[PDB]
Amino acid sequence: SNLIEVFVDGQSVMVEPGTTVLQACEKVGMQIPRFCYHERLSVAGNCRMCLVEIEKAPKVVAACAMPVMKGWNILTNSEKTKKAREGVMEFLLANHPLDCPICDQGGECDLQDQSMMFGSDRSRFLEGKRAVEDKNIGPLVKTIMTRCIQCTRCIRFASEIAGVDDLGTTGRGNDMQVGTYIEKMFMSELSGNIIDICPVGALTSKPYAFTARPWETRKTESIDVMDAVG
Amino acid sequence: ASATRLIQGLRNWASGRDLQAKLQLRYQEISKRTQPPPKLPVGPSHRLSNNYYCAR
Numbered sequence: 600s601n602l603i604e605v606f607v608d609g610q611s612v613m614v615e616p617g618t619t620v621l622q623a624c625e626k627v628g629m630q631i632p633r634f635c636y637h638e639r640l641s642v643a644g645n646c647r648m649c650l651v652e653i654e655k656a657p658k659v660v661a662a663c664a665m666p667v668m669k670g671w672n673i674l675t676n677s678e679k680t681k682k683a684r685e686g687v688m689e690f691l692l693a694n695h696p697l698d699c700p701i702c703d704q705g706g707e708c709d710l711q712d713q714s715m716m717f718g719s720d721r722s723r724f725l726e727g728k729r730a731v732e733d734k735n736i737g738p739l740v741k742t743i744m745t746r747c748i749q750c751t752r753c754i755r756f757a758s759e760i761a762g763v764d765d766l767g768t769t770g771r772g773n774d775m776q777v778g779t780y781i782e783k784m785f786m787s788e789l790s791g792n793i794i795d796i797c798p799v800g801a802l803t804s805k806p807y808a809f810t811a812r813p814w815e816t817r818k819t820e821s822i823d824v825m826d827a828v829g
Numbered sequence: 830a831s832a833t834r835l836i837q838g839l840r841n842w843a844s845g846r847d848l849q850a851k852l853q854l855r856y857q858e859i860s861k862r863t864q865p866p867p868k869l870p871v872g873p874s875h876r877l878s879n880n881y882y883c884a885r
């Protein structure tokens with residue numbers, strides 16, 4: 600009755616047809632690591648972290664936006680899956696500056712967690728390390744676009760939820776500045792939400808900026824006020 | 830050290846172990862400080878093109 604079997608590590612499970620491989624792995628409990636996927640936005644494929652070795656094929660394919668054919672067998676813990684993840688993680692950490700002391704996401708990074716739990720232990724790339732000059736987006740959001748990994752998630756969030764259309768990719772090669780061209784103060788509603796969209800420390804809060812670091816705090820239940828929805 | 834031979838002989842006679850030879854007051858073979866700086870070798874990694882973290 601409209602269910603397709605996937606063999607996640609040999610374990611069979613039923614999946615609604617048309618949905619992604621990644622939702623099947625999250626159904627059985629697996630987390631394939633991801634940087635450009637999010638469970639509220641459209642599914643672009645620009646981060647290359649979601650890869651998986653599907654059997655009987657010489658080519659590793661993505662799992663952020665893969666449709667599910669009948670009767671798969673998914674290997675999330677094979678050899679070249681780990682080699683692809685270590686390779687892509689070594690690619691990401693080249694043009695990314697040493698700011699982990701002063702970056703505002705010491706406890707709440709994503710490069711740090713996934714670089715521990717999937718990445719290499721030694722680096723390379725002795726020269727290089729380009730630098731992008733920052734902008735001044737607004738007095739609400741502090742912005743250093745050097746840490747921007749060009750993951751195209753603020754763009755999709757803006758253009759598909761904010762509806763404002765004031766963010767864009769510019770350029771080619773390494774030189775892809777994600778930002779706003781005309782030096783306009785990007786001011787709209789929900790612009791405070793963009794500092795949790797950005798998975799790296801590139802779009803942080805302006806008044807908060809250098810007052811804590813997220814392992815010292817303790818987290819507490821509460822309810823929204825001054826809005827009728829809560 | 831810094832003693833005459835009479836009390837030296839009294840030391841070596843009260844305990845016939847040749848106390849003048851080794852006495853646990855070092856004068857010479859204190860290790861000469863301000864040593865040269867070391868260059869630490871790195872073991873079974875920084876070996877390029879084969880250090881696969883999937884392996885080890």
Ligand code: SF4
Nearest residue numbers: 699702708710799800
């Ligand atoms: S986002 Fe910040 S904490 Fe994460 S790797 Fe970059 S500089 Fe370090």
Ligand code: SF4
Nearest residue numbers: 747748750751753797
């Ligand atoms: S600013 Fe942040 S969310 Fe936007 S593309 Fe760069 S890393 Fe991604």
Ligand code: FES
Nearest residue numbers: 635646647649663
């Ligand atoms: S999740 Fe970024 S490439 Fe599939």
